[PDB]
Design an enzyme around this catalytic site. Sequence first.
Site, mmCIF file in Angstrom:
data_model
loop_
_atom_site.group_PDB
_atom_site.id
_atom_site.type_symbol
_atom_site.label_atom_id
_atom_site.label_comp_id
_atom_site.label_asym_id
_atom_site.label_seq_id
_atom_site.Cartn_x
_atom_site.Cartn_y
_atom_site.Cartn_z
ATOM 1 N N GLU A 35 -7.710 7.196 18.750
ATOM 2 C CA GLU A 35 -6.600 6.600 19.163
ATOM 3 C C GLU A 35 -5.463 6.360 17.857
ATOM 4 O O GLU A 35 -4.346 6.152 17.914
ATOM 5 C CB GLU A 35 -6.913 5.098 19.705
ATOM 6 C CG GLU A 35 -7.735 5.291 21.148
ATOM 7 C CD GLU A 35 -6.963 5.941 22.263
ATOM 8 O OE1 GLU A 35 -5.440 5.813 22.065
ATOM 9 O OE2 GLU A 35 -7.393 6.018 23.183
ATOM 10 N N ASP A 48 6.826 5.753 30.201
ATOM 11 C CA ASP A 48 7.221 4.836 31.084
ATOM 12 C C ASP A 48 7.759 3.327 30.369
ATOM 13 O O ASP A 48 7.916 2.615 31.004
ATOM 14 C CB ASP A 48 5.918 4.446 31.771
ATOM 15 C CG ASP A 48 4.810 3.709 31.010
ATOM 16 O OD1 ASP A 48 5.012 3.388 30.011
ATOM 17 O OD2 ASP A 48 3.648 3.557 31.788
ATOM 18 N N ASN A 59 -2.477 -1.400 25.597
ATOM 19 C CA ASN A 59 -1.032 -0.991 26.314
ATOM 20 C C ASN A 59 -0.581 -2.271 26.896
ATOM 21 O O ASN A 59 -1.055 -2.975 27.338
ATOM 22 C CB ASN A 59 -1.383 0.212 27.067
ATOM 23 C CG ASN A 59 0.063 0.714 27.994
ATOM 24 O OD1 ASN A 59 0.337 0.093 28.919
ATOM 25 N ND2 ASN A 59 0.829 1.622 27.210
HETATM 26 RE RE LIG Z 1 -2.468 5.371 25.284
HETATM 27 RE RE LIG Z 2 -3.422 7.513 22.287
HETATM 28 RE RE LIG Z 3 6.498 -0.157 34.320
#
Ligand SMILES: [Re]
Ligand SMILES: [Re]
Ligand SMILES: [Re]
EC number: 3.2.1.17
Length: 129
Positions: A35, A48, A59
């Site tokens: 990550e 997005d 996120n």
């Molecule tokens: Re992600």
């Molecule tokens: Re990621």
């Molecule tokens: Re969104």
Amino acid sequence: KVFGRCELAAAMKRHGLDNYRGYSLGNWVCAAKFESNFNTQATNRNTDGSTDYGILQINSRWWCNDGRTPGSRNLCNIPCSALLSSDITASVNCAKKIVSDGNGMNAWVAWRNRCKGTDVQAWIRGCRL
Ligand SMILES: [Re]
Ligand SMILES: [Re]
Ligand SMILES: [Re]
Ligand SMILES: [Cl-]
Ligand SMILES: [Cl-]
Ligand SMILES: [Cl-]
Ligand SMILES: [Cl-]
Ligand SMILES: [Cl-]
Ligand SMILES: [Cl-]
Ligand SMILES: [Cl-]
Ligand SMILES: [Cl-]
Ligand SMILES: [Cl-]
Ligand code: NA
Ligand SMILES: [Re]
Ligand SMILES: [Re]
Ligand SMILES: [Re]
Ligand SMILES: [Re]
Ligand SMILES: [Re]
Ligand SMILES: [Re]
Ligand SMILES: [Re]
């Protein structure tokens, strides 16, 4: 902060991730590797408009507030900036909420695609824990 592999393994263990929700330490270290490459300051903007933050790339659509993700939630009740600290407490506590929510570590796409099913113990091999 950019953690070393064994340094992060130890920190994650001290913060209660070893076997949390049944996921051995190596799973968490592997997830962080792919990550964020162990960089607490990692950020990445998604198509997005949400952003992923920190060593586990949590996120903003669901988990933290950054004020620039319309319609989003803040289920860990933290500013996303807290996920960038050299101290991993906020990232760990939020990750514990995420992994408990039903889909386990599949929430982390990189874990699913690169760690799941592999010899994750290799990520903690040789470390003093
Ligand atoms: Re992600
Ligand atoms: Re990621
Ligand atoms: Re969104
Ligand atoms: Cl390393
Ligand atoms: Cl490494
Ligand atoms: Cl392991
Ligand atoms: Cl927002
Ligand atoms: Cl912006
Ligand atoms: Cl919320
Ligand atoms: Cl906030
Ligand atoms: Cl699970
Ligand atoms: Cl891999
Ligand atoms: Na949010
Ligand atoms: Re810590
Ligand atoms: Re400590
Ligand atoms: Re362990
Ligand atoms: Re192994
Ligand atoms: Re440890
Ligand atoms: Re130990
Ligand atoms: Re420890």
